[PDB]
Design a protein around this ligand. Sequence first.
Ligand code: CLA
Ligand code: CLA
Ligand code: CLA
Ligand code: CLA
Ligand SMILES: CCCCCCCCCCCCCCCC(=O)O[C@H](COC(=O)CCCCCCCCCCCC)CO[C@@H]1O[C@@H](CO)[C@H](O)[C@H](O)[C@@H]1O
Ligand SMILES: CC(C)=CCC/C(C)=C/CC/C(C)=C/CC/C(C)=C\CC/C(C)=C/CC/C(C)=C/CC/C(C)=C/CC1=CC(=O)C(C)=C(C)C1=O
Ligand SMILES: CC1=C(/C=C/C(C)=C/C=C/C(C)=C/C=C/C=C(C)/C=C/C=C(C)/C=C/C2=C(C)CCCC2(C)C)C(C)(C)CCC1
Ligand SMILES: CC1=C(/C=C/C(C)=C/C=C/C(C)=C/C=C/C=C(C)/C=C/C=C(C)/C=C/C2=C(C)CCCC2(C)C)C(C)(C)CCC1
Ligand SMILES: CCCCCCCCCCCCO[C@@H]1O[C@H](CO)[C@@H](O[C@H]2O[C@H](CO)[C@@H](O)[C@H](O)[C@H]2O)[C@H](O)[C@H]1O
Ligand SMILES: [Cl-]
Ligand SMILES: [Fe+2]
Lengths: 48, 63, 36, 39, 29, 297, 28, 37, 62, 27, 253, 339, 31, 109
Amino acid sequence: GRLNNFAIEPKVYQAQPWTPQQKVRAALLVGGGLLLVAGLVAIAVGVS
Amino acid sequence: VIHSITIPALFIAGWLFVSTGLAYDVFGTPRPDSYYAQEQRSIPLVTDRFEAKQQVETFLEQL
Amino acid sequence: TITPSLKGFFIGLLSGAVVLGLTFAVLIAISQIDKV
Amino acid sequence: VFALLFFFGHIWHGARTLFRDVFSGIDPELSPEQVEWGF
Amino acid sequence: METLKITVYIVVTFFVLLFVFGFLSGDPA
Amino acid sequence: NLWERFCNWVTSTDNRLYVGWFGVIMIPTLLAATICFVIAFIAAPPVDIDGIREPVSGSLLYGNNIITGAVVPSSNAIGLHFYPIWEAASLDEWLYNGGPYQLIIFHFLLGASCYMGRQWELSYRLGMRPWICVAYSAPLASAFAVFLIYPIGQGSFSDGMPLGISGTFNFMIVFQAEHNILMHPFHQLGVAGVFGGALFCAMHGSLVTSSLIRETTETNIVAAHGYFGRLSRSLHFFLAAWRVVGVWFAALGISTMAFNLNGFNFNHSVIDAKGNVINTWADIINRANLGMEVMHE
Amino acid sequence: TVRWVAVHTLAVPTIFFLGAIAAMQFIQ
Amino acid sequence: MEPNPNRQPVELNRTSLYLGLLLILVLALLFSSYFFN
Amino acid sequence: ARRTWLGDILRPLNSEYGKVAPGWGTTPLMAVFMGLFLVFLLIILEIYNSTLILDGVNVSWK
Amino acid sequence: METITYVFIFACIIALFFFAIFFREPP
Amino acid sequence: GLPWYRVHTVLINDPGRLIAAHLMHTALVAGWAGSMALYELATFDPSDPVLNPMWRQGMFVLPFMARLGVTGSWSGWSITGETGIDPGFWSFEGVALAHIVLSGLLFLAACWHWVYWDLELFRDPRTGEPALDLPKMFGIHLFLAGLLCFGFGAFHLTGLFGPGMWVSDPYGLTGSVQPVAPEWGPDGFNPYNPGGVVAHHIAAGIVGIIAGLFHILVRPPQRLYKALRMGNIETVLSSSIAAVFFAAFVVAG
Amino acid sequence: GWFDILDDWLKRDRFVFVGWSGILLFPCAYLALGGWLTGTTFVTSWYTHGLASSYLEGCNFLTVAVSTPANSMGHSLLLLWGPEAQGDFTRWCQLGGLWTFIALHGAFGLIGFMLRQFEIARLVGVRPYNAIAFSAPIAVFVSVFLIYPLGQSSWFFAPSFGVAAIFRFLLFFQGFHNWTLNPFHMMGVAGVLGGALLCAIHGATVENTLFQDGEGASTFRAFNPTQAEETYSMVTANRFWSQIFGIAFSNKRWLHFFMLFVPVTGLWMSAIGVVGLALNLRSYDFISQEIRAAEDPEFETFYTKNLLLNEGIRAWMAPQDQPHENFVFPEEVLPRGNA
Amino acid sequence: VNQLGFIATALFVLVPSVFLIILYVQTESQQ
Amino acid sequence: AEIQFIRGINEEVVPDVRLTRARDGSSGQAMFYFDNPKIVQEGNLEVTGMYMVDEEGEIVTRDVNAKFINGQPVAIEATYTMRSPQEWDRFIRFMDRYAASHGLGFQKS
Ligand code: CLA
Ligand code: CLA
Ligand code: CLA
Ligand code: CLA
Ligand SMILES: CCCCCCCCCCCCCCCC(=O)O[C@H](COC(=O)CCCCCCCCCCCC)CO[C@@H]1O[C@@H](CO)[C@H](O)[C@H](O)[C@@H]1O
Ligand SMILES: CC(C)=CCC/C(C)=C/CC/C(C)=C/CC/C(C)=C\CC/C(C)=C/CC/C(C)=C/CC/C(C)=C/CC1=CC(=O)C(C)=C(C)C1=O
Ligand SMILES: CC1=C(/C=C/C(C)=C/C=C/C(C)=C/C=C/C=C(C)/C=C/C=C(C)/C=C/C2=C(C)CCCC2(C)C)C(C)(C)CCC1
Ligand SMILES: CC1=C(/C=C/C(C)=C/C=C/C(C)=C/C=C/C=C(C)/C=C/C=C(C)/C=C/C2=C(C)CCCC2(C)C)C(C)(C)CCC1
Ligand SMILES: CCCCCCCCCCCCO[C@@H]1O[C@H](CO)[C@@H](O[C@H]2O[C@H](CO)[C@@H](O)[C@H](O)[C@H]2O)[C@H](O)[C@H]1O
Ligand SMILES: [Cl-]
Ligand SMILES: [Fe+2]
């Protein structure tokens, strides 16, 4: 009689090869993050 | 199935470990005459941490 | 510099890495032999 | 005390996670909108 | 004290005699 | 005419609780020891367990709580004597000398023996085998050894176990200082039986709960045990027989410590050629036992 | 390579240690 | 609109009530002495 | 359902719900990074336990 | 006040024993 | 039909009421922090810091305020004991009323997320079922945690924008809140060096930002997606309980 | 090629199962048991404790122990390559490093055994309630052998892996901690005693209310993971215990969850108590009882008699159990009952 | 002697028992 | 074209099967219902799962629980899930090879 509750997992599908739309957003992620960390080591020098 | 290559050579390997006096040297257990020194009634407890090995081998020259 | 403690730590790390690589290499070779 | 009790909470929840299909009775990789066939 | 003594003696004889009597006599019906 | 209405009411298994012919003795004795235990735990005067005039105040209204409260055993002046109320001179002399302890342990030991009889009685009336009776005999023998047999061997009812939480700890500490119970092997079989009984309880519980799917009753009982394990039917006889004979052994272990055949004192086992004594782990235990033994005068 | 290690890792120091223990009784 | 269809009811039968009341009452009888000190 | 403003702004992030990389992916990189974290945690424990004493590192209140 | 808290918890335990034996839940 | 120990599990299949329960739990923690700070502000004796300090009076929440820089109250004393200063807004009372109004705001947002539970953000557009992108969620949460770790270390504890932390002598005689410089080198792993804490939040913030960008751009492999049961919400709770009991053992040590 | 061949070799059918968990279990378990056997056979305790605790020094099975390290070691890990022994196996066996060897290996062997229970249950396809019931001996081992010395001075105050050393540990917790008066300890005693009591009653009544006693005993096919639970009747046992005790189970599931539940909870509460006793946060005294003992000197309960016995255990066991403190107690300061 | 130690015992008795009693008289109304 | 409970021994009692499929032709198991099988009577061995031997390999179903009435096992109900179409067509092939050899209805709803 006692009920329970579990999680409904989404369907497992493999990642396709990308397109320009998602490739240029991955590029604007990586090229953003590299100059972000390049600024952060400069702040790390300027506080030490 | 049948296996009688060397059972009782291991028994003499265990007998000659203790009877010759090798186990006292390997495991560092003191001999029954060699607990205390010839003059003092003190127990050689390790009092240091990084001088403890030198403390035990400093005690073992009193014997 | 390299201390005796740091060098003994290197001895312990290399012997642990060895035992951990040797156990998996023996198990991988024995699993590749008995491949049914 | 809280870290020792949270160790038991980890055991119980990892066991509930990995053993979902036997704790529930319904495998998680089948879609729930299932019909039937007969044999 | 003898008013509590013969009172307790009456109850212990009353219960052990009832236990012995009911154990044996009265097994059917 | 009227007796058969009573002989039908007693012997019927269609009751809520089965009051047998053993229940005829079991009910007033276990009611008398219960009501005297609640009275002598809440409100009871101090009792000198020794023969001096410094008495042990064990009751709740004399400055105790649930942990430290007890029903204090009888005096050393009484010993193994039978002490009812009419044997005493007054009621205050009975209460000062530990008479409630004798009253409670005699009615409790009589009512627990008739509890074993009532278990066997109903079993025979229900058409069952007699094992339950047997298995309850192990805490029954353990309670008989701690309230009767050890006072018989030591010669006084002051050496019986007190009826309190802290009095049990005092009994255990004083018993270890006198007898060295921890190195006595019949006690070690009791620890192995109790530890193994808890182990097999948790292990047997977990292995069933994990292998039982559904079970119903029409209200023809049905159960669908999920079988098939990985790589006769005597699991429950071993499950009963491990903890039982373990508790039996430690019951007759303290029954042999009653007559002072006690434990194992490995007193100066190891030696040195210079007339020197090298201690072991037994000398530390015997060194502690001399701690608690000297404080017990 | 087989369950023959159960004799090579549990019976060899067992027979060695029983030889040591049987030698240990004839001391002093 | 939809009232979040998930609100399953809570059961607690009488034998669960007796077991929980026994647990709370003997825990208070155990810890009362230490709370009163 | 409700199509709020933040539901339309934060959507691309809750969009690939079960999208997996095929095969083993980046698991050897994860394994050598877990081994590096294990050696790091070891060094830090043996510095605090003082079973790895360094030059200029005095593990006390000084 | 200190004693009567212990007696009150013990009396509620006995009252729970009475309600558990005789007012038990039917199958 | 649910037993008493399973009543919270109705939030497994709805990401918005789980937000509502988490927002309420956080409203409870912030309300305890404000209330504990107010109760310790009431029963405090700041008249003798030599022989009656805050560890002698049972003050538990007081030292975690004073460790990060909160010296002084609005009544006109200090933890160091100078009996007149202007601390500004950020006194003990200021941060207590800040956590009180934060607890109220998180309760109001918990009420909004409990009423408006069914959004488009929690559903997939294809199926009707609610689904969360956990392998990604860990990337945005790790990017935010590394950004706040680097911000707190590189700006607070250096004193470039902030007070310092509590630094003392080896015997606890002269100690106050001073800005401390990050220690690069092997002395930063000395636990009694305060520079290693700053160097630690700079470095671990940079590694957290790098790894959060790694998950925001790289999907998990199929092998450990099916092995570690991702897509279930309960593996996240498992491994989070693992990290939090590791962390509780480290702070007890 | 790489991984699934090793995975299919480990999970293969054999005399013993050795999964992925066996690589953690079997070296750690084998080395912990072997280090205990080579420590009780050969290794002394003379340089740490000042005792003789091996078969080589002429001890029996009860008085051997692989004793704890010295108090000057602190909470050092005592590695063989570490800064204390420095590769010397004689000095590592003399300084007590075999204790830390056996303790860390017992920790990782218990980790590997509970992973083995999860792996076998993930194979057989059952719910892993045995690994949830094994959370209690792991918590007892972690709270006693690891957390208690890590909260105390060093590894010296820990159980020293013997029989008589375990009895010394029980007497030490009675004398120095008043550990019988702890309520978490009392819940531990009640969990273990209720489990053994549940074990005996359950065995007594399944063996009694069997479906086929002996007369028309058609021996049906029995499977081992049912733990023989088809063979007895639930209705006869419920009818027995509703009339004997007035309370009885009517589930075969709740009864066995109760048998899972009682000693694991008991063992988990005593783990919480020993974790509190690591910081000397014990349940030693009732404060108003101390005030009533100080008010009039003719007040005596069994608790105030127990405190004098703990004082006796402390002051008489203390110069020998703690020889690094160098306690010189004269006979005049030792507590006697005739004083 | 604690004055507020009696409140702890009353809050330990009452608060889980009020939860179980509300849960039981709320489940008998519609289970 | 057989069904085994103990590898080496075969089940000579035809099971009542109830196949089920997801609407996306991806997943779906098969609730078996062996009504008084020969493994239930005697044997005294140990079942390690339902083994479904064939010519294209073998399909193992670990979910195998037996139903008892009053101490007596009467019925063994097993369930096997698919979770992929490459095992679904393998199971329908093993089903066509079984229903050719023992005689089964396939009354599709
Ligand atoms: C982040 C930590 C965390 C979270 C979010 C959860 C969440 C969950 N747990 Mg897990 N668990 C945890 C840690 C956690 N647990 C820990 C540390 C343990 C060991 C103590 C457990 C042991 C555990 C078990 C054994 C079970 C769960 C279950 C559950 C589920 C239902 C809970 C419920 O309805 O209780 C309802 C609870 C009540 C109505 C009252 C509980 C009252 C407690 C005992 C005393 C009062 C606590 C006090 C208010 C809180 C202060 C907490 C603070 C000091 C930590 C839910 C998914 C259940 C399950 O899996 O369902 C399928 C389940 O059976 N948990
Ligand atoms: C009794 C101990 C124990 C047990 C039985 C489990 C069991 C489980 N864990 Mg937990 N876990 C534990 C302790 C344990 N864990 C500890 C202490 C941590 C660190 C906080 C974790 C962190 C953890 C995470 C983050 C996850 C699990 C998960 C799991 C599940 C899958 C198996 C797994 O990942 O194993 C993990 C493997 C081990 C515990 C074995 C570790 C062996 C180490 C590497 C040996 C190290 C030797 C050391 C270097 C020697 C030096 C000692 C030094 C003192 C000198 C399962 C429920 C996963 C899960 O829940 O999936 C749903 C999951 O995501 N575990
Ligand atoms: C130069 C860069 C730098 C510097 C100077 C530091 C400096 C520090 N780090 Mg940080 N770190 C860095 C970069 C850095 N870090 C990076 C890039 C990362 C990765 C994101 C980390 C991740 C990290 C972690 C995960 C930890 C540190 C910790 C520390 C501190 C170590 C001293 C200490 O008190 O340990 C005390 C802690 C230990 C000695 C670790 C104990 C390990 C245990 C024993 C593992 C097993 C636990 C398990 C649950 C079982 C316990 C059983 C038990 C109950 C008996 C110190 C502030 C530690 C810390 O927070 O201390 C407060 C810590 O745990 N760091
Ligand atoms: C998680 C990381 C973290 C933590 C715990 C702290 C903690 C602290 N900071 Mg540090 N800090 C950090 C990261 C962190 N900081 C970063 C990343 C930076 C760079 C931006 C700083 C830079 C910084 C400065 C420049 C200052 C602090 C100060 C403080 C202290 C007072 C603030 C407070 O209690 O707010 C608690 C906040 C809440 C409970 C949230 C409440 C939010 C709602 C809207 C309610 C608002 C209430 C209130 C009415 C608003 C206050 C108005 C105020 C701006 C004047 C406190 C010890 C101050 C200090 O020195 O005090 C002595 C101070 O001047 N910090
Ligand atoms: C002064 C200090 C006293 C300390 C406490 C001492 C009493 C301990 C007694 C045993 C505890 C419970 C163990 C069984 C657990 C269980 O679950 O028994 C249940 C009854 O529980 C209950 O009714 C809980 C109340 C216990 C009353 C005890 C009365 C004892 C009789 C005294 C007079 C004897 C002539 C009923 O069984 C189950 O009840 C339900 C549980 O979900 C389900 O229906 C199950 O399928 C199953 O039927
Ligand atoms: C007043 C005074 C001096 C003291 C009072 C203070 C007290 C009591 C303090 C102690 C507080 C306690 C006990 C704290 C511990 C709590 C804890 C951690 C665990 C509790 C363990 C526990 C619940 C034990 C009870 C076990 C028990 C009595 C079981 C009996 C169950 C039973 C009757 C089974 C019979 C039975 C068996 C069977 O096999 C079948 C088939 C059927 C149908 C049956 O009915
Ligand atoms: C029993 C106990 C416990 C537990 C405890 C707890 C858990 C507690 C909690 C506590 C808490 C948890 C508290 C809280 C509080 C809170 C508060 C107090 C809040 C408040 C709030 C407010 C006041 C707000 C307001 C408002 C609003 C509403 C809106 C906005 C505005 C304003 C601000 C107006 C333990 C076992 C551990 C220990 C012992 C004791
Ligand atoms: C520590 C260490 C190690 C290890 C080693 C080992 C692992 C060893 C092993 C060992 C072993 C493994 C041993 C074994 C042993 C055994 C024994 C010792 C046995 C005995 C037996 C007996 C004695 C018997 C008895 C009896 C009984 C039981 C009853 C009846 C009667 C009789 C008598 C028959 C190493 C080097 C690696 C490294 C370093 C450290
Ligand atoms: C069949 C069982 C029969 C059992 C009979 C007893 C059952 C009921 C006992 C309840 C206990 C009440 O007992 C009563 O407690 C109060 C404390 O509140 C005691 O009072 C005592 O402590 C209070 C503190 O509160 C002091 O002010 C007072 O000087 C002191 O005498 C009374 O002296 C006692 O008469
Ligand atoms: Cl005494
Ligand atoms: Fe059973």
